[PDB]
Amino acid sequence: SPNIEACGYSDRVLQLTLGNSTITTQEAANSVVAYGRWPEYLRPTEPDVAACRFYTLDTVSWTKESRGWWWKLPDALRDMGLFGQNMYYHYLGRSGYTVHVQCNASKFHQGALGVFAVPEMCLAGDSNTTTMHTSYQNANPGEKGGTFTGFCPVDYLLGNGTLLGNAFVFPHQIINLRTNNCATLVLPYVNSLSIDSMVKHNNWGIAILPLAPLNFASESSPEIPITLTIAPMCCEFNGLRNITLP
């Protein structure tokens, strides 16, 4: 689906400095808007830059054995400064996400990463009658995240009971080592309501699985790191409660 061919190497280093953050993106161009919609305001307190700035999660090692990785939103960013706060001090909250996944290697490494953003991504446990099942804490692995396997999400079953090959229905991009180094996914707020409670309900779900294995030239770096930078877009929350300071 993502049959693009920007250039191949590197051209232009154009940094995204929003608020306090700074990114220095590989370029800027080549981004996918989920379903063709930009995160908009409810048609409330709009913090903007205060909440709307780049936060970086923990970097994870990609290896010749890796089966995949997964995170939840806003869940992961629950331990992020002002966005971490505003999440616990309000009963409401809707937010967009600029999932900017970067992965650098050399002209000598080969493989392919597919960043899949699954809206309402519940994980594997074939009890249709009683879903949710796995405890609040397991279902929410924070900023460190969870991982796929060959709480148990099977890779070819996308960790939900449906053949991986059809995953390509959800918004995605393929970080193919020989071409792109970056993945840009703007995910607008998707839920059954106009606004809801962030602490309990998980909107999206970033799942990066390997479509091609990792092969490194003779002897080189045994593993390569993948980084996930996420940012809250056009967010609002109602309404401050006894700023119950922890």
Partner 1 sequence: GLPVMNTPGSNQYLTADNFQSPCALPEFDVTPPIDIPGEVKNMMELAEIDTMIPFDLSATKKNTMEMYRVRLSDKPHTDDPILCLSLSPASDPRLSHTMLGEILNYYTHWAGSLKFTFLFCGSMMATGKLLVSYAPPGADPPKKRKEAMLGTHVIWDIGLQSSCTMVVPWISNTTYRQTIDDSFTEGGYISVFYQTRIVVPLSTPREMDILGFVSACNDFSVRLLRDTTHI
Partner 2 sequence: PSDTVQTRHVVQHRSRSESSIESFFARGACVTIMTVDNPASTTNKDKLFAVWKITYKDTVQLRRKLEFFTYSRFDMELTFVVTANFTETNNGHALNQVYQIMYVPPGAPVPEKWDDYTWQTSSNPSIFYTYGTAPARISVPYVGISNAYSHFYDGFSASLNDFGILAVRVVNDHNPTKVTSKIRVYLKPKHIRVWCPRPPRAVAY
Q: Would you call 35 helix, strand, or coil by DSSP? A: helix
CB of residue 136 vs partner 1: minimum separation in angstroms?
12
CA angle (210 as vertex; 209, 212 as ends), nearest 5? 160
Q: Would you call 188 helix, strand, or coil by DSSP? A: coil
Q: Would you call 75 helix, strand, or coil by DSSP? A: helix
Tell me how far apart the alpha carbons of residues 159 and 136 are, in angstroms, rounded to a whole number: 17
* Termini Cα distance of the chain: 46
Tell me how far apart the alpha carbons of residues 76 and 57 are, in angstroms, rounded to a whole number: 8
Question: Would you give the binding string for partner 2 spanning residues 135-174, x where CB under 8 A is met?
Answer: -x--x------------------x--xxx-xxx-xx----
- Using CB under 8 A as the binding rule, whether residue 130 contacts partner 2 is answered as yes
CB of residue 228 vs partner 1: minimum separation in angstroms?
21
Among positions 23, 122, 154, 212, the unique one binding partner 2 when judged by CB under 8 A: 122
Q: Which stretch binds partner 2 (CB under 8 A): 16-24, 61-69, 78-86, 188-196?
A: 188-196
Q: State the residues that interact with partner 1 by CB under 8 A.
A: 1, 3-5, 8, 34-37, 91-92, 107-112, 155-156, 163-169, 174, 176-179, 188, 190-197, 200, 211-213, 215-218, 238-245
- Using CB under 8 A as the binding rule, whether residue 239 contacts partner 2 is answered as yes
Tell me how far apart the alpha carbons of residues 27 and 10 are, in angstroms, rounded to a whole number: 8
Question: Which of partner 2, partner 1, none does residue 195 bind (CB under 5 to 8 Å by kind)?
Answer: partner 1
Look up tokens 């080969």; give the residue.
110
- Using CB under 8 A as the binding rule, whether residue 85 contacts partner 2 is answered as no
CB of residue 130 vs partner 2: minimum separation in angstroms?
6
Between strands 232-236 and 182-187, the pairing is: unpaired
37 phi/psi in degrees, rounded to 5: -120, 135
Longest pairwise C-alpha distance within the chain? 60
Question: Which of partner 2, partner 1, none does residue 111 bind (CB under 5 to 8 Å by kind)?
Answer: partner 1
Query: What residues line the site for partner 2 (CB under 8 A)?
Result: 35, 44-45, 118-122, 127-132, 136, 139, 158, 161-163, 165-167, 169-170, 190, 192-194, 200-202, 205, 238-241
